[PDB]
């Protein structure tokens, strides 16, 4: 019936961490290789994703108890949750009005077609669009949005994690907060938490499809050369 | 006293190869990560150099007898001559008027300071500037400029070359052409060929200094992550 001085603390850190790592103007975008509308969008989106990974790392490092994990694990979690966290955070820029990520003028408004010119199929882009919409329809409070990201990241069931007990512990602690927060601060949240955990499962397959279509790219040098070192390292197999 | 039907042929291929691989407008430059004036120029120049390597490869593949070399050698030569060929071809964009490479508007005019913001020292940039000037003062015919590049590339004394006999053969054949061409087509070229071979030696040390300052970068991830896969592969040690 009332948040605790430690649960308030975690929410405060997470919300700040997100503000510290997510520009709502997308001003850094000019720094990317320009968009071209084969695979004309690959350089830009690769830049976009590489940049995002950095932001996702900055966020993670501020998640409570994350720093205390082994370098090995922090990497295991980041590598496997990378793309998911990116899909989650991109919801702030997605919009139902025109079914696209609107990160700026005509140049930075990303529609499903643009991503096609990055080597991904409309087939596996549909679930993404569908996922963004449902997430958008949840009208998540910043706290829940922020908590969902941190919970997603601290998933214990990722290829590579060692101490999956300390990680499961951290995660379902976060989960408590989300439930607690929703239950006492979000009117009509009766069903929300379940719906939110639904998203995580959605993300897994969304992650899966991507990791496949990415291997294609990563194997064709004419395309892999368009990627950034960070991307290649994060979505690479070399552990 | 008169060029031969085979020496004319080689000059024709080389000159075309260069036209095919060197835009005099530098229109592709917009595609690079924008210039910022630490290490603000690194992303742009890295893009610039990565792009150039591709052009240098396109040129090499058209050098007579180059394709017939082993993939192993073509790589051995390209890796070791990469930066030199780039320094040579950049002379077309360098200008004594303002002692810089002028590849476009204010954004693409590269002065020595800009390169400092890419992790290189003014100390080892001086010989480059000095080298460009002397080369510029030679007022090379396109043929000689083009021949010098091909000769530089086909140097037999590079770390990695196997069949250094077939390579030395190709090179001093090219050399003949340069001498022959200069001697019958370039009035006042009495001394030129020697001066041109001087440049090659200059290039070696210019290459050396760079390979050092590059290892620095390549070892600091915050910087190496700013490079492109192609650059990392070409200036890498992994043979």
């Amino acid at each position: 019936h009332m948040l605790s001085d430690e649960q308030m603390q975690i929410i405060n850190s997470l919300v700040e961490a997100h503000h510290k790592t997510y520009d709502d103007s997308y001003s850094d975008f000019v720094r990317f290789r320009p968009p071209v509308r084969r695979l004309s969008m690959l350089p830009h989106l690769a830049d976009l994703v590489s940049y995002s990974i950095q932001k996702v790392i900055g966020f993670a490092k501020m998640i409570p108890g994350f720093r205390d994990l082994t370098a090995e694990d922090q990497i295991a979690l980041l590598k496997s949750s990378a793309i998911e966290i990116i899909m989650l955070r991109s919801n702030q820029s997605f919009s139902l009005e025109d079914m696209s990520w609107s990160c700026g003028g005509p140049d930075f408004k990303y529609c499903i077609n643009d991503v096609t010119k990055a080597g991904h199929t409309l087939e596996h882009l549909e679930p993404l669009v569908k996922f963004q919409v449902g997430l958008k329809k949840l009208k998540l409070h910043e706290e829940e949005h922020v908590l969902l990201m941190a919970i997603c990241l601290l998933s214990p069931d990722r290829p590579g994690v060692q101490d999956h007990v300390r990680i499961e512990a951290l995660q379902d602690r976060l989960c408590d907060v989300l439930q607690a927060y929703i239950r006492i601060q979000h009117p009509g949240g009766r069903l929300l938490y379940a719906k939110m955990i639904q998203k995580l499962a959605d993300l897994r397959s969304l992650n899966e499809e991507h990791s496949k279509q990415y291997r294609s790219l990563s194997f064709q040098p004419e395309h892999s050369m368009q990627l950034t070192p960070l991307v290649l390292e994060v979505f690479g197999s070399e552990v | 006293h008169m060029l031969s039907d085979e020496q004319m042929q080689i000059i024709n291929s080389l000159v075309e190869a260069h036209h095919k691989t060197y835009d005099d407008s530098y229109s592709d430059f917009v595609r690079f990560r924008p210039p910022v004036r630490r290490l603000s120029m690194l992303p742009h120049l890295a893009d610039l150099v990565s792009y150039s390597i591709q052009k240098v490869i396109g040129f090499a593949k058209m050098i007579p007898g180059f394709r017939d070399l082993t993939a192993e050698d073509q790589i051995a030569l390209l890796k070791s001559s990469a930066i030199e060929i780039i320094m040579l071809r950049s002379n077309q964009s360098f200008s004594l008027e303002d002692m810089s490479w002028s590849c476009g508007g204010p954004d693409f005019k590269y002065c020595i300071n800009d390169v400092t913001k890419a992790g290189h020292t003014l100390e080892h940039l001086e010989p480059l500037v000095k080298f460009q000037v002397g080369l510029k003062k030679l007022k090379l015919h396109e043929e000689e400029h083009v021949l010098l590049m091909a000769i530089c590339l086909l140097s037999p004394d590079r770390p990695g070359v196997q069949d250094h006999v077939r390579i030395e053969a190709l090179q001093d054949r090219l050399c003949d052409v340069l001498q022959a061409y200069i001697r019958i087509q370039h009035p006042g070229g009495r001394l030129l060929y020697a001066k041109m071979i001087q440049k090659l030696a200059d290039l070696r040390s210019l290459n050396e200094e760079h390979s050092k300052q590059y290892r620095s970068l390549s070892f600091q991830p915050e910087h190496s992550m700013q490079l492109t896969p192609l650059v990392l592969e070409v200036f890498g040690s992994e043979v």
Partner: peptide, 10 residues
């Protein structure tokens, strides 16, 4: 390996 990720994780 993961030179870059290590670096970025302070």
């Amino acid at each position: 390996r993961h030179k870059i990720l290590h670096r970025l994780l302070q």
